Amino acid sequence: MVVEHPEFLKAGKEPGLQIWRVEKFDLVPVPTNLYGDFFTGDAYVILKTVQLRNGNLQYDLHYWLGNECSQDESGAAAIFTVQLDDYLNGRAVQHREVQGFESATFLGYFKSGLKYKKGGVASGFGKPVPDEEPNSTDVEETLERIKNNDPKLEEVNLNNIRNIPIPTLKAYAEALKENSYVKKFALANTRADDHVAFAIAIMLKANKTITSLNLDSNHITGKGILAIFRALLQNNTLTELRFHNQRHICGGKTEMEIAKLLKENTTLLKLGYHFELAGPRMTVTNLLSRNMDKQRQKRLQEQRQAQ
Amino acid sequence: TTALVCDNGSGLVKAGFAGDDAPRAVFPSIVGRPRHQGVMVGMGQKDSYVGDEAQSKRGILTLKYPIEHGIITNWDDMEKIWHHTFYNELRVAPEEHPTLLTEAPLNPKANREKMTQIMFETFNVPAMYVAIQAVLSLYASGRTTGIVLDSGDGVTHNVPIYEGYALPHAIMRLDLAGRDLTDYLMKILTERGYSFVTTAEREIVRDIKEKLCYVALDFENEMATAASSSSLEKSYELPDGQVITIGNERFRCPETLFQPSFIGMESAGIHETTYNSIMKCDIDIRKDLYANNVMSGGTTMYPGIADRMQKEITALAPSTMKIKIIAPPERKYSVWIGGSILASLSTFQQMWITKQEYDEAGPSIVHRKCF
Ligand SMILES: Nc1ncnc2c1ncn2[C@@H]1O[C@H](COP(=O)(O)OP(=O)(O)OP(=O)(O)O)[C@@H](O)[C@H]1O
Ligand SMILES: [Ca+2]
Ligand SMILES: [Ca+2]
Ligand SMILES: [Ca+2]
């Protein structure tokens, strides 16, 4: 939109001269008997309105910059010039006037002549490295807890845990299958692989609860990745998925298949991955952006109810 | 109450509070993750390190930049960065502050939306705005009309602006910027016999660049000078204490900006693309573009670069034309300062996209409220 403000509303009503001074990020009128006396430590916006035969108004906007004026003030003049011009529907011509270099037209506006006075209102302007605190989750204990459907477990973080056996990771997936309490599951940097990814994919067809899964920094490959993304065809719960930093990058036909596979997913809102190719990278970004806006469409028809 | 300003570039986040003359936080825009091949139990439960933290640990991490050539490419790490900025750096509750963000000039439509999506859905900001970087830099210089050369760590742009707005058809773009220039200085120094490949060797080359490099006024003269004497050589002290001499590499590195062939780019030089950009504009604004050339961003810091631009643009422009290059001293931060001012203006409360506006109209709202 376009800005209103009380001086905007008085601006360019009729032939004449208006002069404002930038004061602490606001536009303030210069008293009409002070016109032509310009503090060299300040910045000004000047509007020259002329009558046209039609009865409409010709505008000229000049912004006057004092040599000692501070950066915010002069930056503010230039911007105020722009907003004022916009507000007038772009019909004003913009002139930059610096002290000592001013236009003859500008100077011609003061019959009595232009004075500089020193001074003005004051500016509106006003480590460690590698190791801390290993991950203490007990894998066994936790795996157990998932089987029994423990409602105290809403979060499972295996991140950075070294030396977990693959069939145990596989077992976690098998265990998460009917769980109704685990919304989050982070295995980053576990040396997990495609078998683990396959298991997880199977899991995701049945599982209605987990919203967030983190595979970062693993050995998963394109067939692991992809297997998960086909699975997500049957899954409307998972909103977030992160595979950053696998040991070997999948290549383009994998990135392509990802962006393809996700076309029919209405659900996932976030994908951690670094796409090498911009084409899929963009496609995926548009899809996630569509899915996210549906969550706003609901939310609105939700909001559109309470009367 | 107070407004936040975030200027997210390819190498550096500049972030802070509107009204301040300077950003409170300036840090590497990166997200680290454990390197294969490697170790660490030190990470505890974390999938990643962000910002300064990750820079520390660069040894044991593989670093990744969410912004590439000034454009957002990895969105999940962009959220991270944004989150770190709010909570860990500015230490604020983002749902309490109007938030101004910046973007590259030609940023694709859908990215402008996505940035709008995330700010409202994930951070729940009461209101937000997205401004073009170069445009803010022009404003910070106290101008509505001008053509900005903006060159950072990731991308270099030529952005003509008239009575407050960029002219997109005339914008020119070059992928070459500081990071590429560092890699280029590593080479030719190496071809001189100093061998920098190391994760912490690059670190030193970067220092040499920001310290000893400069732009030659005339390249073949400077090369003829350097060939017939040592007047252009400068001594440089490494951390091992060794003091070595470096030659014409001083200006062959930044010459890449005017001669992108040097690194293998088929692209014309920033001087030629400046002229082109102006030439793509309406004749009647050209004289005002020629007379206001404003430089922005840290890759414009090289001593000599203004004067080199004056000369090349003079050799291109008509005989008559008044040509001036403005190189503000604070121009590593121009973009940020320009936003700081704009978001601080009394007139600004009406420019925000509100949460409510977003909730009702959806993210395409930003194409109609932000030019
Ligand atoms: N004194 C210097 N001389 C040359 N280059 C410099 C100097 N100081 C910083 N740089 C470079 O400036 C860059 C940082 O500038 P800036 O923060 O404007 O870039 P950015 O916004 O991260 O990048 P981009 O604008 O491309 O997205 C880095 O490449 C750094 O090497
Ligand atoms: Ca002042
Ligand atoms: Ca106009
Ligand atoms: Ca930048």
Side-chain angles (χ1 to χ4, degrees):
Chain A
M1 232 136 35
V2 166
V3 109
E4 136 296 289
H5 159 288
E7 299 304 324
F8 274 70
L9 294 160
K10 285 134 91 188
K13 282 176 166 168
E14 65 196 334
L17 204 49
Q18 299 162 292
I19 304 194
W20 297 268
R21 178 173 69 147
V22 166
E23 306 180 0
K24 296 189 162 44
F25 296 121
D26 182 22
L27 205 49
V28 175
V30 180
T32 67
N33 41 19
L34 308 176
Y35 283 18
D37 278 4
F38 282 108
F39 274 123
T40 62
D42 281 337
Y44 295 68
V45 188
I46 297 84
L47 178 59
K48 181 63 183 273
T49 313
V50 180
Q51 189 84 10
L52 300 167
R53 147 216 301 215
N54 259 11
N56 63 298
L57 299 173
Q58 156 187 121
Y59 299 113
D60 281 81
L61 274 163
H62 310 251
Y63 48 112
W64 189 89
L65 311 188
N67 244 255
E68 289 76 60
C69 110
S70 57
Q71 175 171 22
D72 60 312
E73 293 172 330
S74 61
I79 299 175
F80 283 139
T81 296
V82 176
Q83 302 176 334
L84 250 172
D85 185 357
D86 286 346
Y87 176 93
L88 300 190
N89 312 116
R91 304 213 303 109
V93 188
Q94 285 174 38
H95 310 269
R96 180 164 185 270
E97 310 283 2
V98 313
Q99 173 179 349
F101 304 90
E102 304 99 330
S103 87
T105 306
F106 184 73
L107 296 169
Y109 291 168
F110 322 82
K111 355 106 195 213
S112 148
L114 209 188
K115 214 263 234 166
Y116 305 147
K117 62 166 157 186
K118 280 292 207 292
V121 43
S123 185
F125 269 150
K127 315 323 207 160
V129 79
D131 63 344
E132 260 148 330
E133 277 149 58
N135 180 7
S136 70
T137 311
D138 192 85
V139 194
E140 318 299 358
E141 208 174 6
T142 306
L143 172 52
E144 197 167 340
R145 278 158 79 185
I146 294 148
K147 268 139 149 160
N148 310 143
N149 191 246
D150 173 13
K152 273 206 203 355
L153 190 77
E154 264 171 78
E155 230 120 271
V156 188
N157 205 287
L158 311 179
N159 294 353
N160 300 313
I161 281 163
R162 355 184 201 94
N163 288 100
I164 312 185
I166 305 280
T168 327
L169 295 170
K170 273 162 90 175
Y172 269 85
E174 177 64 303
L176 286 162
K177 267 250 255 311
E178 289 276 316
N179 187 314
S180 39
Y181 294 122
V182 169
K183 301 174 161 179
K184 208 249 235 214
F185 180 24
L187 53 155
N189 203 20
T190 61
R191 269 223 173 241
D193 64 25
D194 281 322
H195 296 286
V196 182
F198 297 148
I200 291 173
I202 304 294
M203 175 264 273
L204 283 158
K205 297 143 166 158
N207 176 297
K208 309 215 287 267
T209 221
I210 312 178
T211 69
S212 172
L213 182 84
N214 187 324
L215 307 177
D216 285 3
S217 290
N218 280 334
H219 293 250
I220 305 162
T221 237
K223 211 235 159 207
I225 286 155
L226 286 175
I228 290 153
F229 274 106
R230 303 182 202 108
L232 284 170
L233 302 165
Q234 315 186 221
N235 181 311
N236 51 32
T237 45
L238 193 98
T239 66
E240 314 192 9
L241 170 68
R242 304 176 162 90
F243 44 105
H244 304 269
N245 194 44
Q246 307 302 310
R247 226 237 212 202
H248 296 116
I249 78 302
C250 40
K253 339 231 197 153
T254 330
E255 303 192 350
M256 299 310 300
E257 239 331 87
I258 288 175
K260 181 147 141 231
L261 277 172
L262 167 77
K263 156 75 198 269
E264 256 70 53
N265 185 304
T266 224
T267 277
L268 190 80
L269 301 181
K270 316 216 134 147
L271 184 67
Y273 171 63
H274 304 144
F275 287 88
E276 251 82 346
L277 311 183
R281 180 170 64 221
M282 273 297 305
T283 297
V284 167
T285 296
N286 289 325
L287 292 166
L288 302 173
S289 152
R290 176 201 72 194
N291 299 356
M292 218 304 150
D293 207 47
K294 286 183 224 251
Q295 270 338 93
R296 192 208 57 98
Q297 289 275 45
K298 277 186 171 233
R299 172 267 234 53
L300 189 47
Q301 160 76 341
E302 271 195 22
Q303 192 224 302
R304 222 255 188 207
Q305 235 66 281
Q307 19 125 264
Chain B
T1 11
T2 310
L4 306 182
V5 178
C6 296
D7 180 38
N8 287 120
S10 306
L12 285 174
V13 193
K14 285 72 68 166
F17 296 93
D20 282 352
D21 56 24
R24 216 63 88 62
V26 176
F27 60 93
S29 159
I30 56 178
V31 175
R33 289 193 178 74
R35 263 240 268 272
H36 335 261
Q37 297 111 16
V39 49
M40 216 70 274
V41 96
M43 234 127 340
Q45 272 195 347
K46 281 128 140 280
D47 49 41
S48 53
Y49 291 102
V50 186
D52 286 317
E53 212 159 343
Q55 182 60 243
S56 298
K57 305 186 192 261
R58 66 199 109 122
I60 76 132
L61 304 158
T62 5
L63 290 180
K64 252 65 157 49
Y65 302 82
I67 293 186
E68 229 199 313
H69 303 310
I71 303 299
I72 309 177
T73 60
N74 317 310
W75 286 91
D76 189 57
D77 289 353
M78 199 68 238
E79 253 170 276
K80 286 200 171 61
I81 288 285
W82 278 325
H83 177 277
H84 190 87
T85 296
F86 291 129
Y87 286 107
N88 297 328
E89 284 277 336
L90 301 176
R91 296 249 238 274
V92 287
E95 71 262 3
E96 289 175 346
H97 302 279
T99 281
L100 175 99
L101 305 181
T102 73
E103 64 171 20
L106 296 167
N107 190 17
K109 268 220 288 183
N111 294 17
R112 329 184 58 256
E113 293 191 30
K114 190 96 176 170
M115 152 166 28
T116 303
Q117 269 177 325
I118 299 177
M119 286 286 113
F120 286 123
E121 303 284 3
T122 311
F123 300 94
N124 200 39
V125 302
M128 64 103 65
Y129 195 82
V130 188
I132 289 135
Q133 284 149 2
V135 173
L136 296 170
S137 274
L138 192 82
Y139 291 165
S141 64
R143 290 161 167 81
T144 64
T145 289
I147 173 174
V148 181
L149 182 72
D150 194 11
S151 197
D153 191 63
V155 72
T156 299
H157 279 101
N158 297 127
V159 184
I161 297 136
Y162 182 78
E163 290 194 354
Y165 299 87
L167 311 147
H169 56 281
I171 288 163
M172 302 299 278
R173 192 226 259 109
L174 181 60
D175 289 3
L176 176 59
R179 235 204 298 303
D180 299 334
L181 246 28
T182 295
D183 301 347
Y184 183 61
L185 183 46
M186 275 183 350
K187 282 228 320 197
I188 49 172
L189 285 171
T190 279
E191 292 179 341
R192 170 104 341 170
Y194 291 109
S195 180
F196 311 76
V197 192
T198 309
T199 341
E201 244 131 57
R202 177 117 110 85
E203 242 292 296
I204 273 153
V205 175
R206 167 183 144 207
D207 186 65
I208 290 174
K209 187 194 69 181
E210 297 185 1
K211 262 131 175 174
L212 312 189
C213 284
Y214 72 103
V215 173
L217 183 53
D218 189 303
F219 178 66
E220 301 301 355
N221 298 348
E222 210 80 355
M223 284 294 283
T225 307
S228 82
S229 102
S230 86
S231 59
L232 303 169
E233 292 175 2
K234 236 223 163 112
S235 71
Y236 178 89
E237 187 181 307
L238 308 149
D240 67 26
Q242 188 178 16
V243 177
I244 88 283
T245 271
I246 136 170
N248 66 13
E249 287 96 6
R250 272 168 58 99
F251 58 84
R252 323 211 327 260
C253 160
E255 179 72 8
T256 313
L257 298 167
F258 310 79
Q259 297 205 54
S261 356
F262 286 8
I263 50 149
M265 279 174 186
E266 325 243 53
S267 249
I270 61 168
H271 59 291
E272 303 167 289
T273 52
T274 304
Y275 169 72
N276 300 346
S277 170
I278 302 172
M279 274 294 143
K280 274 190 146 209
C281 291
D282 191 292
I283 8 162
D284 307 293
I285 78 175
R286 299 192 184 155
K287 176 260 253 172
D288 276 335
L289 296 170
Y290 277 117
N292 307 258
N293 258 267
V294 177
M295 317 208 108
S296 178
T299 281
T300 68
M301 291 311 291
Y302 293 102
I305 189 166
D307 295 331
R308 173 56 166 294
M309 208 71 30
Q310 189 63 43
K311 186 180 173 189
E312 302 288 1
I313 307 280
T314 296
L316 283 177
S319 40
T320 168
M321 192 78 59
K322 174 63 163 170
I323 290 167
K324 169 151 117 146
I325 318 295
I326 296 87
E330 75 289 357
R331 63 196 187 274
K332 242 131 77 106
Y333 311 100
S334 287
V335 179
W336 190 91
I337 296 163
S340 176
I341 293 167
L342 171 62
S344 304
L345 300 170
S346 65
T347 47
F348 205 58
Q349 270 131 17
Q350 292 128 69
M351 259 112 227
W352 304 111
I353 303 180
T354 47
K355 177 50 151 67
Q356 208 227 84
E357 280 163 333
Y358 163 79
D359 286 333
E360 302 183 351
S364 70
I365 188 73
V366 86
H367 302 288
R368 316 195 287 285
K369 261 244 216 74
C370 299
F371 275 77

